[PDB]
Amino acid sequence: TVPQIRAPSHVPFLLIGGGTAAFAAARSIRARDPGARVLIVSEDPELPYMRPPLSKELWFSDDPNVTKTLQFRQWNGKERSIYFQPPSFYVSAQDLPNIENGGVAVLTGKKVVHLDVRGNMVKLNDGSQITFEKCLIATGGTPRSLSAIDRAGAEVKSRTTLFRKIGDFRALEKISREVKSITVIGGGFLGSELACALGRKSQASGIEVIQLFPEKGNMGKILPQYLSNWTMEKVKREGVKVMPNAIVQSVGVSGGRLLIKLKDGRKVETDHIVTAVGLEPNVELAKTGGLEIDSDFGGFRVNAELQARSNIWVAGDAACFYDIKLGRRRVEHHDHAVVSGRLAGENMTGAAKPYWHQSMFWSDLGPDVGYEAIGLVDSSLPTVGVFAKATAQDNPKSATEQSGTGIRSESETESEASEITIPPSAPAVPQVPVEGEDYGKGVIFYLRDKVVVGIVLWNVFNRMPIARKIIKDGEQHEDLNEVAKLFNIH
């Protein structure tokens, strides 16, 4: 067996990229047009898989075999495959045009590098060509790097990982068992999940874990300062040296270790760096395809139907879409990937439906801390937070036990509450006098006009439909403590 040239071929439905959005689009097309012939072409050799477990549950397991099988343990102890479907669900490219009732084929280890819109064709990196009738671009993005690491030498670039894939979890996991110290650069949800995860391994290994970022505290661009600060102390307590207000001036090699120099005088000595500083949408096809990239937000600009050009749609992290409440925007949400992929797939079969979904986001920092967000969440906005003591059910683990899944967009559902009526206050709880240290859950309302434009929920689950409805209706609430009763915050 030797390398060979693929003959030109044709496929009714071509999906460029094999991630969450591509997979959801393939199922949608198959549901809408039974017998459909769908081909996914994907650069990474792996079959389609969900990403959330990579910075999360896969680090919380004592079984060495999980790194190989990727059958991760949810917080409720129940196993789940990181893959959407196993190999048997798919067919090979070669067989697709001949199989009865059609199917979903997958061609991994191949990259589409040229899109010809008017000729309905693409070219792969190996020179072969595939004509299509309908095409979805769902190429995701590539992790951003740090400028200082880019200007940095071979030695340091060889000791920095960007965190996005299976390969990254595997390498970072191995490194956590080989070196004395690892630094996470990035204060966002993802960098924070990685810090907690290594801090947990640290309990057994004794490795040093540092997390550094330029904000005053974790997720500082998103959470109000008080909760950002609470969060920062929480992460630190997982055994992480957190360094806020840190701007990387340069990185170099000293003593055989990495030497990161900060603008303010500080210096960090460490053996490996993982960055989590955001994403660049994969838009290389915009050029041959004559597609518009959004100059303000990045990604492919699409219309209400997720369409970019004739017979071309985009979904997932790669799309700059028109949010029904916020206007042009792009997100990195698992929910959006699934919903938008499904809708694109439906539109590929002729539906012409607008994307009116309000995408949600969630983050877990271990089984005991969970956040959910929706709409415009920006710490520069005026905000109203309402809090209460947590009940036993108010944590990511219980939310996983109740629903049987850890992927929060699944358990929350994609729906929107049909009506909002402020329920009666709950029965009084006999208690000693309550202090701020005693709260463990809450809702934070983000405002613009006296209208709620965004919501972050802290340890409140199964209420996302209600948060969607409050944001959609756009009422001026006279008293947000009454509305918080909708989130069982009393």
Ligand X SMILES: Cc1cc2nc3c(=O)[nH]c(=O)nc-3n(C[C@H](O)[C@H](O)[C@H](O)COP(=O)(O)OP(=O)(O)OC[C@H]3O[C@@H](n4cnc5c(N)ncnc54)[C@H](O)[C@@H]3O)c2cc1C
- The reply to whether 19 sits in an annotated binding site is yes
**Strand intervals (E) in 5-86:** 9-16, 37-42, 71-73, 79-81
Contacts of 264 (CB under 8 A, 6+ apart): 245, 246, 247
Alpha carbon distance 278, 317 (integer Å): 11
Q: Please tell me whether 405 is known to bind a ligand.
A: no
Q: Is 73 annotated as a binding residue?
A: no
> Of the two residues 340 and 379, which places its CB atom closer to ligand X in the complex?
340
Q: Could you give the CA distance from residue 245 to residue 301 in angstroms, rounded to a whole number?
A: 34
Between residues 318 and 460, which has the closer beta carbon with respect to ligand X? 318
> Distance between CA 152 and CA 261 in Å, rounded?
12
44 is an annotated ligand-binding site residue: yes
191 is in an annotated binding site: no
Cβ proximity to ligand X: between 316 and 367 the closer is: 316
| Cβ closest to ligand X, residue 14 vs residue 36 | 14
| Residue 317, marked binder | yes
Alpha-carbon gap, residue 188 to 279, rounded angstroms: 12
* 157 marked ligand binding residue: no
Please state, in angstroms and rounded to a whole number, the distance separating the CA atoms of residues 171 and 177: 10
User: Nearer Cβ to ligand X, position 55 or 211?
Assistant: 55
**Is 401 labelled as part of a ligand binding site?**
no
Q: Tokens 């206050």 identify what position?
A: 425
Which of helix, strand or coil describes residue 53? Answer: helix
Closest distance of CB 249 from ligand X, Å: 27
CB of 42 to ligand X, least distance (A): 5
Residue 289 annotated as binding?
no
Selection from 25, 49, 18 nearest residue 342 by Cα: 25
DSSP secondary structure code for residue 427 in this structure: P
Closest CA to 106 of 95, 90, 125: 90
Among left, alpha and beta (phi > 0; psi -120 to 50; other), residue 12 is alpha
Q: What is the rounded CA–CA span in Å between residue 139 and residue 316?
A: 8
Closest to ligand X by CB, 55 vs 120, is 55
Where does this chain bind ligand X (CB under 6 A)?
16-22, 41-44, 51-52, 54-55, 111-112, 138-140, 163-164, 190, 282, 285, 316-318, 332-335, 337, 361-363
For residue 55, the minimal CB distance to ligand X (Å) is 4
Shortest distance, position 425 Cβ to ligand X, whole Å: 32
Could you tell me the two tokens for 336?
Answer: 């959006």
Report, in Å, the least distance between residue 161 CB and ligand X: 12
Q: How far is the CB of 442 from ligand X (least distance, A)?
A: 19
Q: Residue 224 or residue 289: which is nearer to ligand X going by CB?
A: 289
Give strand pairing partners of 388.
Answer: 441
Residue 480 identity (one-letter amino acid): L
Minimum distance from CB of 139 to ligand X (Å)? 4
Query: Residue positions in the annotated binding site?
Result: 17-21, 43-44, 51, 56, 75, 112, 164, 187-190, 215, 221, 278, 317, 332-334, 362, 372, 462
Query: Residue positions in the annotated binding site for NAD(+)?
Result: 75, 187-190, 215, 221, 278, 332-333, 362, 372, 462
Query: Residue positions in the annotated binding site for FAD?
Result: 17-21, 43-44, 51, 56, 112, 164, 317, 333-334, 362
